[PDB]
Design a protein around this ligand. Structure first.
Ligand SMILES: *[C@@H]1O[C@H](CO[C@@H]2O[C@@H](C)[C@@H](O)[C@@H](O)[C@@H]2O)[C@@H](O)[C@H](O)[C@H]1NC(C)=O
Ligand SMILES: *[C@@H]1O[C@H](CO)[C@@H](O)[C@H](O)[C@H]1NC(C)=O
Lengths: 531, 536
């Protein structure tokens, strides 16, 4: 019984496990319950704090993955399998994980809290790309990651109802943040220094905690990787949530709110997942059925309204995108695209793809998009058309919403740092045409290249170390730059005036200005006016 | 006769003419100036199509320029070279239908290709007698036979009551057509070849050339065409019959007339010419720039349909066309109407002034289309930079009115089978009197095409002189063969045809030809494809 692996938290005692990291051991406490299992009558309901337990709780293995749709697009393909559940599915899934250096930190260490992505319909804190041992061992960080309900279980809502109020998956996240405040000191973490970081829907989640008052006292800084609370897919109005929920109910034979929800609660979990995707209003990509809802509660107004009118002084934020945000979503629904060929498309296929990629666009807006993205020197060139299709999806869903958030936060007094991640992993299994896809900067931030057995190059290992440094320096001080390192160059804050951001790749930081400025003016200023 | 120069006496359909021997830097040239080609369109002939000139007896003196067609005179900058070089340099009169001919001296031995110049001036001004249109250099150096005619402008040439008998519209275009017929019948007497006639013109002149290309009866009067900074399609070169009627009747009211067409026109004909000129600008529907009151009207006659419809569905095989723009088409128009601009300061404007400028420069734009323009032209890295805003205002005006209409025309002509050559003129005359911020303004390539730099007394640089000669070569080679390239000289890079596929065009400046691709392709897609669809 190694005393370093024995911790007492408010609920009782835990036993962690010593894990081996390339440069030394780390302590891991996996599968710690932070809420009462949200099963039976608790389905769709806000999470309740976990009741205390007797004895020593075994926290040596990852707990179950929240019930969710499983990808079958490319069966057995590492590219899609690396994101699939790697533990049993269960509605009993509200657990969190803590990695700490071994022996545990002598003095209070800044805490990083990871919130995974997966379109609000999938994901798990147990995936290998979210392994916190490297950041714990190399940077001496205390890293926490929690499971939160996704799909219908975490976001199906009948606004105004008592039994399915919406946003419970965000409340799962909040409860875990509350747990860190109350317990992290026992692991040597500093509850006075908590940094949230997440990617895609995880980044959007982080943004929603920034925009929801009760969450604000639970953290101090934030990192939003390729996702934002504002934008076309991260939220739905109360009316559209209600619509989707009642339509899903009908598809599974159900049934007044109470009765509808009571009947939904009797349905096996897989039945809900089976009809999840049938409620979207149009054929599309980068759109998800059950996501956070503007309820007038967790979200007092639309993210747009809240970022425009919020005061963000005393908040530091790191935001960024990867070089090809859209490619990944194309094989998932646009005729002509595949991971197995060059995906050279026709102009006809391009016009078709735009309707799918910008599903809420009127015919006129769609033509505006086509005309803005067509390269008039080579209007028929398949290579340009394929790349332009990717750019349209990535700009509309991630890049422009990120530029928008970055600008409003800076204007509203926040300290902001922005980046574009441009390195494609040597180990990437998707075709070259997809470039640096959505989600592929994560393995570098978590430091996986430091694992010899993974076969990353020596340069990639040096690169990962650089990133871990930027992220942990940011967690420690709200500034990603090295406090004792001259000869850099420096990563300057992003401002509405100069709009500076940096490129993250194998070469030294390079400062650029204007994040897709002309194109985002099109998405952020003109298309809306084409109301 | 008997005692004068035997080499200056010529006979044309209407009678005998006596020209004058003019000195050109490299030798003498023959000039026949002020040849009448129509009956004076005065009195009951005002607003009416021109009638052929009745024969005269004796020898008509053709040694001096004739009157300039009655027109508005520019006062923006009194005594300023920049605006004065374009103002009438002979007496204003409604009796102004005369043309001029320059030919080598002695006259050419064998039939020489003819160049016919059609001046610009927004269809409300201009004259074939201006110094920048002097044909002596092209005549002397390239051995060209050059012809230029006066045509009615403003109300006299374009006021119309569509359908009426007394003001059918487009009579200024009919004045030009009559001069083209005069050339067919008479140019051989000067040594010119009626089988080889090339029309060239700038701004409204270029638009005019384009309308002759789109009008059947004019097609048999020429073989090749050059359109410099102007097109028949576009936002300012034509108005619908309804808009012409509206403007004509509003003008009639402003001068106290008259009801029915006959009476209204009969009353307008009693008005002093100056009163019509004094009110012509008062009929435009919005505060604007690059918009002219009385211009060609889509009458269903001279213009069977809109130039747009005609270029989209026309067959242009066997047509060779040279087309181009200068580097800063819009700058000239900003000092004539956009608050914040002046020829006397750097015209650094505010974002507010830019937004107001856009409404004036794109007068037909709805609020939404105007915002689309502002968003497209704003540099989002430096949205408040005054230098960028000033330059973007210029580009907005130039692209909307000249550059994109030219891109559109070049593309449809090529697709419809025409052989097209395209250029962008980028050299600013060392003698330019406009401020530097204006760059290479609309109209400032003309003095080079005509070879004025060859005149020692004008103070152009030695490089400008060689440059002028190159341009004259391109234009006359094109007139001679339908190809600007020198049949010999394989050395100099070649000027390739413009095609929808490659979209090639060349840069004309002091350096050797450089081929570029896509004439403002991205921006012109906005003006030519998107703005129209924003038709709702
Ligand atoms: C540039 O000039 C514009 C026109 O104003 C006139 O010309 C200038 C040079 C002065 O002489 C002025 O007194 C004249 O009325 C102005 O509207 C514009 O604001 C000026 N821009 C400057 C100098 O900032
Ligand atoms: C690429 O693969 C997909 C799926 O097999 C196919 O539909 C498409 O036609 C292929 N060809 C292309 C677009 O390059």
């Amino acid at each position: 019984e190694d005393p370093q692996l024995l911790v007492r938290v408010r609920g009782g005692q835990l036993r962690g496990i010593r894990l081996k990291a390339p440069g030394g051991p780390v302590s891991a406490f996996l599968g710690i319950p932070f809420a009462e299992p949200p099963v039976g009558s608790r389905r769709f309901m806000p999470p309740e704090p976990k009741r205390p337990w007797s004895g020593v709780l075994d926290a040596t293995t990852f707990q179950n993955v929240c019930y969710q749709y499983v990808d079958t697009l490319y069966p057995g393909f590492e590219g899609t399998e690396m994101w699939n559940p790697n533990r049993e599915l269960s509605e009993d899934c509200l657990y969190l994980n803590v990695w700490t250096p071994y022996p545990r930190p002598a003095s209070p260490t800044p805490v990083l809290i990871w919130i995974y992505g997966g379109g609000f319909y999938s994901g798990a804190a147990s995936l290998d790309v979210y392994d916190g041992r490297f950041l714990a061992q190399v940077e001496g960080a205390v890293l926490v990651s929690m499971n939160y309900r996704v799909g219908t279980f975490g976001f199906l809502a009948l606004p105004g109802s008592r039994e399915a109020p919406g946003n419970v998956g965000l409340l799962d996240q909040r409860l875990a943040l509350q747990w860190v405040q109350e317990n992290i000191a026992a692991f040597g973490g500093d509850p006075m220094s908590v940094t949230l970081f997440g990617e895609s829907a995880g980044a959007a989640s982080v943004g929603m905690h920034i925009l929801s008052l009760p969450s604000r006292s639970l953290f101090h800084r934030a990192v939003l990787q390729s996702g934002t609370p504002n934008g076309p897919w991260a939220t739905v109005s109360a009316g559209e949530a209600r619509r989707r929920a009642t339509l899903l109910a009908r598809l599974v034979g159900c049934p007044n709110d109470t009765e509808l929800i009571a009947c939904l609660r009797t349905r096996p979990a897989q039945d809900l997942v089976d009809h999840e995707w049938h409620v979207l209003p149009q054929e599309s990509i980068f759109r998800f059925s059950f996501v956070p809802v503007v309820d007038g509660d967790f979200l007092s107004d639309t993210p747009e309204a809240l970022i425009n009118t919020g005061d963000f002084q005393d908040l530091q934020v790191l935001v960024g995108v990867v070089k090809d945000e859209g490619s990944y979503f194309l094989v998932y629904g646009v005729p002509g695209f595949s991971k197995d060929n060059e995906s050279l498309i026709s102009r006809a296929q391009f016009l078709a793809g735009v309707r799918i990629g910008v599903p809420q666009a009127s015919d006129l807006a769609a033509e505006a998009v086509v005309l803005h993205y067509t390269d008039w020197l080579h209007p028929e060139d398949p290579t340009h058309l394929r790349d332009a299709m990717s750019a349209v999806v990535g700009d509309h869903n991630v890049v422009c919403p990120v530029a928008q958030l970055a600008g409003r936060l800076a204007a509203q007094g926040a300290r902001v740092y922005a980046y574009i991640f441009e390195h494609r992993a040597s180990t990437l299994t998707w075709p070259l045409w997809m470039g640096v896809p959505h989600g592929y900067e994560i393995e570098f931030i978590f430091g996986l290249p430091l694992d010899p057995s993974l076969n990353y190059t020596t340069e990639e290992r040096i690169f990962a170390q650089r990133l871990m440094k930027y992220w942990t320096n940011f967690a420690r001080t709200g500034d990603p730059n090295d406090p004792r390192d001259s000869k850099s160059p420096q990563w300057p804050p992003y401002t509405t005036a100069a709009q500076q951001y940096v490129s993250l790749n194998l070469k030294p930081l390079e400062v650029r200005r204007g994040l897709r400025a002309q194109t985002c003016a099109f998405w952020n200023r003109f298309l809306p006016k084409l109301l």
